[PDB]
Amino acid sequence: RSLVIISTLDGRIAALDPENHGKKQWDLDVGSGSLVSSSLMIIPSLDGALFQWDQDRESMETVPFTVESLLESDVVLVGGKSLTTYGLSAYSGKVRYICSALGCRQILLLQRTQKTVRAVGPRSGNEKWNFSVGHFELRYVIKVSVADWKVMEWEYQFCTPIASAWLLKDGKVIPISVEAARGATENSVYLGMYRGQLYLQSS
Amino acid sequence: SLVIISTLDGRIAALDPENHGKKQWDLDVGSGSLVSSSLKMIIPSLDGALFQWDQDRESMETVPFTVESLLESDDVVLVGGKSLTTYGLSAYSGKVRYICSALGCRQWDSILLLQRTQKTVRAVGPRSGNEKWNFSVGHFELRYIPIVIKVSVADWKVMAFSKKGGHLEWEYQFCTPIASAWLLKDGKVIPISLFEDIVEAARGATENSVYLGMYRGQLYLQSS
Amino acid sequence: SLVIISTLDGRIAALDPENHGKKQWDLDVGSGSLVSSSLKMIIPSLDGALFQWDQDRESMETVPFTVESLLESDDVVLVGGKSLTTYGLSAYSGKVRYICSALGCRQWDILLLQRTQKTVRAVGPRSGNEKWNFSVGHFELRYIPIKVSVADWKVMYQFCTPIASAWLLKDGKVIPISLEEDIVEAARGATENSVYLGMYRGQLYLQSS
Amino acid sequence: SLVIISTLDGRIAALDPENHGKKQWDLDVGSGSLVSSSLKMIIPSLDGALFQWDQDRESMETVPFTVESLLESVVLVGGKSLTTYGLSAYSGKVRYICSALGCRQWLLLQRTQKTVRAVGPRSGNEKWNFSVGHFELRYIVIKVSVADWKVMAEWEYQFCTPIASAWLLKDGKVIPISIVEAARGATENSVYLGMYRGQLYLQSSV
């Protein structure tokens, strides 16, 4: 009795099998939408930290603002960290509950965090740039490749790109991904694209 | 050039200190109360950081958390969330010229923009979504872009005195407690405050500048 | 057994309560004194906050600053250093066994005393004239195997220099010491029971809970 | 028109009076070095965030504490400092020094520094440390290849130990120097993994 849970870059989850399989068990869709969004050159992390790239430099800087710090504010800023948990049945994946910030409706608990920020014209009310960044964490060799959106012997090639991924077995929930240290740093970092817009991924 | 006020029902109100204080066309937006507790007994400030008060121990002792914290924390799962939003009002008078939450920017057509922050946190236990306790603080903020007015709390009356002979010119009374209050004359929004011969002159100031009221049964407290 | 008194001139003193008050050891770290502050007027709490007083509006205003908060910052540059060192002691009698800090550890050939100290100075070029300061110190207690006041700098031994923290030892447990609309007043009673504004050698200062 | 190099031995230096390249003065201030580790390896930032890599894995994971979040907690000791050294743009020679202990007398080089020890509770013995710091300054053909511990220009000046920041003065300004696939390129070149003396450390931008 074990699983693989795959949080993907479209705000979706999936249960596959490590039982000769890889076969899709259950496959969840919530009302929250994308996992990374940006009208926006500034590249958001899932974190969601904020970074500046201009191709004149190598300079990929972190900037002194995060999608968080910007909410506690010429241009008036709005947004909202969410925190809603589900509420699932390890296999079948049918929500027992979904209990949000402003609501609650009655053994595998899938919590969505989603931070946004918009910037609108003060007179105008209409936004000029925005950011929505979210992610999934849960509680009660499975190698992922991230540029080749795959769990890997069976293999399940996803599209869209993979965000979090947990194998659940026995004791459950453990995720997947001098010179040698100089070598071990660049695999910590990954840039993806969805669909659409650039993003970072973290370690 | 007038005096906006917010309160603990959540609503907002603007007056008219030149026309003897009389409210002029005043509505608002739903989000519930400005404090909703549901938990010897902890007390929420509207800032979001809260205090236990052991009524035996008379122990208004600052419990090492906030409403913000718990959301970035076993027995119960801490759901919740903060929300900021802007109700740009052509008021005087009305006049929802737009609204902007994380869920869109529905506009309007036809100069006072109005912030609304809300900090809830339900705690529910994981076997089923049963709700074990929750706090939801909040507060509007004020910004405008193109007598002597006081709002001491206790009674819920905003009052205009004068600089001349310090007499009361007019006074307006309120139903729920004043949360905040701002005068809007000339343009620059002015916030009315709702608060060894010095060692008590300056002690006076310190017990002056905490208000421990209660609204809709809820025990909450303010300060500066 | 004994009672420990962190007092506001950086000192410690141990009395035992089952003997009228007889002292015993009494620690005088080198670190000086607790609140110091080149000060209508800006008042720090101990621990670290800063509070603006205006005698016009007669309110005690909050400032958007902390002594730490200012180190992570015009014409004036900011200086300081949050320090925090622990002193091992013997519980009785005396006596510093080991000591300290960010800058080394000495053990000399059961009751562990931690000092914290936040500074901020404000200097500005060309020549660096310090225009003001704020230093707030601190103390916490621990250990390995009676009604203090606050207004009178007094215990049940009458102290000289105001008190800041104190504590009990018993069956090995540093236990600290404290310094209808009818129910509201009783809570409304405890909110002005929390904050204390004092005076120590010039600087006016705050304490609360 | 100067060039300034703060290096991992707690010393700064000023080289190149626009034509020469000759270092016109070089002050050192304690503590000593810009990075300590003592010392499953856990490697600090100059910041210092804390990271753990295991060669059993291929990944560099970051840890949930920084040299500061743990200062507010093994008994842990430590302290962030901020000391400023005032000297005149050229020749050096310190005019003021304002640390946490008062000002002394008679272009401003601002050093920040976090340290943390871990000692035994009952016995004041130790058990790891972390001291990390770095330099800032303002007032009143430049290039570094940090892995080759030198500035270049014509000419080049190799330092020991590796150099960390590099501010150039010219006029009245202090300027520093350090498809998706090409963006993929700007991140493996954003971080640098170093060594001193002795111990490993991390860097950003770079």
UniProtKB/Swiss-Prot annotation, chain D:
Q: What is the effect of changing residue 193 to N?
A: Decreased tetramerization and activation, leading to decreased ability to phosphorylate EIF2S1/eIF-2-alpha
Could you tell me which cysteines form disulfide bridges? none
| Source organism, top-level taxon | Eukaryota
Residues annotated as glycosylated are: 129
Where found? Endoplasmic reticulum membrane
Tissues showing expression: Ubiquitous. A high level expression is seen in secretory tissues.
User: Modified after translation how?
Assistant: ADP-ribosylated by PARP16 upon ER stress, which increases kinase activity.
Q: What induces it?
A: By endoplasmic reticulum stress.
**Oligomeric and partner information:** Forms dimers with HSPA5/BIP in resting cells. Homotetramerizes in response to endoplasmic reticulum (ER) stress, leading to its activation. Interacts with HSP90B1/GRP94. Interacts with DNAJC3; inhibiting EIF2AK3/PERK activity. Interacts with ATAD3A; ATAD3A and EIF2S1/eIF-2-alpha occupy a common binding site within the cytoplasmic loop of EIF2AK3/PERK, leading to prevent EIF2AK3/PERK association with its substrate EIF2S1/eIF-2-alpha. Interacts with MFN2. Interacts with TMEM33. Interacts with PDIA6. Interacts with LACC1.
Annotated domain remarks: The lumenal domain senses perturbations in protein folding in the ER, probably through reversible interaction with HSPA5/BIP. The insert loop specifically recongnizes and binds EIF2S1/eIF-2-alpha.
The illness linked here is:
Wolcott-Rallison syndrome: A rare autosomal recessive disorder, characterized by permanent neonatal or early infancy insulin-dependent diabetes and, at a later age, epiphyseal dysplasia, osteoporosis, growth retardation and other multisystem manifestations, such as hepatic and renal dysfunctions, intellectual disability and cardiovascular abnormalities.
Which family does this protein fall into? Belongs to the protein kinase superfamily. Ser/Thr protein kinase family. GCN2 subfamily.
Tell me, what does this protein do in biology? Metabolic-stress sensing protein kinase that phosphorylates the alpha subunit of eukaryotic translation initiation factor 2 (EIF2S1/eIF-2-alpha) in response to various stress, such as unfolded protein response (UPR). Key effector of the integrated stress response (ISR) to unfolded proteins: EIF2AK3/PERK specifically recognizes and binds misfolded proteins, leading to its activation and EIF2S1/eIF-2-alpha phosphorylation.
The protein in question is named Eukaryotic translation initiation factor 2-alpha kinase 3
Q: Which organism is it from?
A: Homo sapiens
Span within the parent record? 104 to 401 of 1116
